[model samples]
Structure formats: structure tokens, C-alpha cells
Target: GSSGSSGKYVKILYDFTARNANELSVLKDEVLEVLEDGRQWWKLRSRSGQAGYVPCNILGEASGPSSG
Candidate 1:
């Protein structure tokens, strides 16, 4: 195996359309790489290699795929 964990991940709980340019469009149950986590908004990158901010409420775990 390679190094430990490089990819941090998260799961979306609801379909979110980009409301702003800084936002990312996401579908429910889709897994995405969490870039930066915030209080109200979380930065994320989709499987398509795009990154943007998404509201924390729309995602599954605030703690992310693993930790906070």
C-alpha cells in the first residue's frame, strides 16, 4: 500500500445546485473530496475534479468521512 490517508471524503445528503459561482453542484449520496470544512459552509471537490464550497447542512457528517 502507499502512504496512509491522502484523500479525505464526505457524502452528500441532498441534491444541491450551484447557487453561486463559489458553490458546487452535487447530487444526493455522491461522494466528494472535502477540501476545507467550515462552520456554515464546507469546501469540497467532486469526482469530476471540480472544487467549490457547499453548505454544511446538505452534507451527511459535519465531522467528514472520519474526523472533524
Candidate 2:
């Protein structure tokens, strides 16, 4: 369910729901370089240039696709 376009964020939702994203080391934390107003989404640039909009308020660091 990705656009496969020139993504700018790291589908945090995917990892948030799959946990494999982080396990595979796809999403990561990046410093806030620029803060745009009304930006419901955020841009995270990983060391590998794989970034995507990771719902800042929706995605949690500990929240992921896990069965507990």
C-alpha cells in the first residue's frame, strides 16, 4: 500500500503495524530540521535516504505490529 514514488518519509505506520519495518531497519528517527505548519505528516530521512510521512501523532516509538 505504498505509492512507490519519491517518498520523503519512512512509512512509520508500516513498521508501527508490521514491526518488521524497524526490524528490517527501514524507519528511523531523524532530527527536526524544518517544521512546516499544518503538516499532519512528517518527513524522516534515514541514513539510507529511505524516508516517508510517519504520522507524528499516530506512530509511537513503542507502538508496532506485535502480538502480545
Candidate 3:
């Protein structure tokens, strides 16, 4: 919950789930904010657009979490 951990964050919460392995999708929270350097598979839009994924935050996380 600090630094970047070599990851810049951009959720890929596989099919409403946590595609684990460092625990990214489960409770790792949402993702993507366009970009700064990396992560540009091809134009990430905001406002009901691309799906950078970080578009909904009524204070949020958990895409099939509770694995504790």
C-alpha cells in the first residue's frame, strides 16, 4: 500500500474477479487514469469512454474479494 511496486495501477479485474498473483484485482482496487509514460495499449478515454476503469469511486474496491 505504498510506492508503486513496479506497477502503475490500471485494473484488469478479470471478468468481475481478482485474477490474482500479487493480489491485483480482488481488492487491489480500480485502475487507469489515461497515462503518463507507460500503459497506452491504445487511447484510454474517460467520462463514459475508454474504461480506464478508475471511473467509479463512490469510495470503492472489491471485484470478488474477501479472500481472507
Candidate 4:
């Protein structure tokens, strides 16, 4: 749901290995904040405030483990 939702967090589905300087490696269960949406890659920020790009094909809906 990228319709300007307040929360743009995405839970990583798999482990991604950074192949370039712009690419980012994320672990499973890590939530990333989407910064920009492009054609092939998406700009995302890690929980630790790191920003980088990742493939658009590897992301999916995040399942809420606990929410009020």
C-alpha cells in the first residue's frame, strides 16, 4: 500500500547481499523505511538509519507481529 501511507516500513523477506556501493544488505525480519520508489529499485532506510537501494522484486507486505 504505497498510497502515501504514514507508515512506509517493509519487512525484508530474504537476505540481500550488497553488490555495489548503492546497494544495501538486509537481514530477514528487518523493517526498512521506503524513501523513494523507482522502476527497478527502491530507496530504503534501515532501522539503524542507513539508506540505500534494493531490488523491487524482493520485497513484500509486512506481517505485524505485535500492534495495538
lDDT of 4: 0.78
Instruction: Give the Cα lDDT of each candidate.
Output: 0.81, 0.39, 0.32, 0.78
Q: After superposition, how far is residue 36 of candidate 1 from its true place, in Å?
A: 0.4
- The residue-by-residue lDDT of candidate 3 on 1-68, one tens digit each, is 64453433344343233233321122333443334333323222333433322223222332335633
TM-scores of the models, in the order given: 0.73, 0.32, 0.16, 0.72
RMSD after Cα superposition, model 4: 4.5
TM-score, cand. 4 vs. native: 0.72
Name model 4 segments beyond 4 Å from true.
1-5, 63-68
Please say which candidate is ahead in lDDT: 1 or 4: 1
For 1-68, candidate 4 gives per-residue lDDT tens digits of: 55765665677888898787698889876778877875588888876767889987788766666973
Candidate 1, position 21, lDDT:
75
- What lDDT tens digits, residue by residue, belong to model 1 across residues 1-68? 74547666788899999988799999988888887776678888887888889888888753545754
Q: What is candidate 4's CA lDDT for residue 46?
A: 78
